Amino acid sequence: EEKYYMDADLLREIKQHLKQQQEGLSHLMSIIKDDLED
Amino acid sequence: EEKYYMDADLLREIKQHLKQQQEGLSHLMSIIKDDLEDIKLV
Amino acid sequence: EEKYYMDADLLREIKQHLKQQQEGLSHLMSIIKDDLED
Amino acid sequence: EEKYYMDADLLREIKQHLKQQQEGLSHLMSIIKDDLEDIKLV
Ligand SMILES: [Ca+2]
Ligand SMILES: [Ca+2]
Ligand SMILES: [Ca+2]
Ligand SMILES: [Ca+2]
Ligand SMILES: [Ca+2]
Ligand SMILES: [Ca+2]
């Protein structure tokens, strides 16, 4: 079972990056979605 | 059929997103690399 | 009305980046979502 | 309550995503900057 030790700090930073990226994309969609469609 | 105008607000928000992505990727990749690399040749 | 000229190539690259980033995040969610929840 | 193990597959896919993000941001930011900057001092 291949697995990787990490501290809570590193896992938190990974989680935060994914969350913030999604939030950013959703923010952009709120501007550009209606242009992609018309 | 080949050229577009983009509104200022949309361009501003895109540039801000890309800048923030970049700052985030750079930090995250550096800390992942340094934490997982536990033995390094001097 | 402040606006910015660009060619189809540049707009396509912007669109592709946003689409590919979303796809990547959705891909990661298909692995990590059940860990975030339990 | 302070340390974790991450499975190999999840780590692999995260690293791949970050690498791909980075390659994409670098390219996109460079072409945006160069296209919008239309006058440059020699
Ligand atoms: Ca719009
Ligand atoms: Ca407009
Ligand atoms: Ca370490
Ligand atoms: Ca999982
Ligand atoms: Ca496991
Ligand atoms: Ca130009």
Side-chain angles (χ1 to χ4, degrees):
Chain A
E1 290 178 350
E2 192 183 312
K3 70 200 180 189
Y4 291 84
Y5 182 76
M6 62 183 58
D7 60 19
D9 291 329
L10 181 62
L11 178 58
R12 178 184 59 249
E13 298 285 347
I14 290 173
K15 286 165 58 185
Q16 189 169 348
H17 181 81
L18 303 181
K19 183 186 180 168
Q20 287 173 332
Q21 193 189 11
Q22 183 61 74
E23 284 167 353
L25 290 176
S26 295
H27 174 69
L28 295 176
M29 293 301 317
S30 79
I31 314 175
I32 205 175
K33 176 185 169 66
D34 58 10
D35 299 284
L36 304 181
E37 304 190 28
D38 182 6
Chain B
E1 295 177 348
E2 175 176 323
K3 313 287 177 188
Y4 298 87
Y5 295 124
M6 184 176 278
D7 279 30
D9 52 9
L10 175 54
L11 179 65
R12 177 192 74 223
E13 295 302 302
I14 290 172
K15 291 184 170 175
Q16 181 168 347
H17 177 80
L18 301 177
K19 174 185 283 196
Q20 292 169 344
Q21 194 184 3
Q22 179 58 85
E23 292 164 327
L25 285 173
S26 287
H27 174 65
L28 182 59
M29 287 169 87
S30 66
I31 63 179
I32 289 166
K33 185 171 181 188
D34 283 331
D35 205 341
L36 289 47
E37 178 183 56
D38 292 290
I39 301 178
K40 181 154 178 188
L41 186 67
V42 178
Chain C
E1 290 178 350
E2 192 183 312
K3 70 200 180 189
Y4 291 84
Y5 182 76
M6 62 183 58
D7 60 19
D9 291 329
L10 181 62
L11 178 58
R12 178 184 59 249
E13 298 285 347
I14 290 173
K15 286 165 58 185
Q16 189 169 348
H17 181 81
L18 303 181
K19 183 186 180 168
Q20 287 173 332
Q21 193 189 11
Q22 183 61 74
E23 284 167 353
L25 290 176
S26 295
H27 174 69
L28 295 176
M29 293 301 317
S30 79
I31 314 175
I32 205 175
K33 176 185 169 66
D34 58 10
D35 299 284
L36 304 181
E37 304 190 28
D38 182 6
Chain D
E1 295 177 348
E2 175 176 323
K3 313 287 177 188
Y4 298 87
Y5 295 124
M6 184 176 278
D7 279 30
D9 52 9
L10 175 54
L11 179 65
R12 177 192 74 223
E13 295 302 302
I14 290 172
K15 291 184 170 175
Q16 181 168 347
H17 177 80
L18 301 177
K19 174 185 283 196
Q20 292 169 344
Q21 194 184 3
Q22 179 58 85
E23 292 164 327
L25 285 173
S26 287
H27 174 65
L28 182 59
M29 287 169 87
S30 66
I31 63 179
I32 289 166
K33 185 171 181 188
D34 283 331
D35 205 341
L36 289 47
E37 178 183 56
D38 292 290
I39 301 178
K40 181 154 178 188
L41 186 67
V42 178

